[PDB]
Amino acid sequence: GSSGSSGQKKDTSNHFHVFVGDLSPEITTEDIKSAFAPFGKISDARVVKDMATGKSKGYGFVSFYNKLDAENAIVHMGGQWLGGRQIRTNWATRKPPAPSGPSSG
Template sequence: MNIYVGNLSYRMTDAELKEAFAPFGEIRRAKVVMDRETNRSKGFGFVEMDDDTAAQNAITELNGKEIGGRALRVNEARPRD
């Protein structure tokens, strides 16, 4: 399952994002989206997990949780248009 994570701290790294989701199960990939021109975080990212049950638990537990001084918005990622 691909999970959207919004309202991230602009200082959060891929490793820190992965660490936040690690207690819920195996992480295939964790990526903070960066601006191509400034190389700064855009404040959101994506986490991929193979186990849908673990991913759903992560969404439930982390949505609204404060990390890095910001309350995360976590939900299942919608396909790109």
């Protein structure tokens, strides 16, 4: 999975990016957008598909206007049976660990 340039549509206003794996092949960008709507307003959602076969690689991204709304899906959708097979959910966003303040001598 190679990376590229940020080709987004609209600059998310401090939204939360939610990762979704195990995305059945029958799934569709439109499906996810409507399958996660029940949680909250969707700003950016897409299902990474192969350029050769054209089938849901098995992972996508779903941003949310707020956090709470996102959490709802991450838990609800997490494993939920959307399309054919089950699906996964995680906080694509990564944060650096906080330092410490030891002392001895």
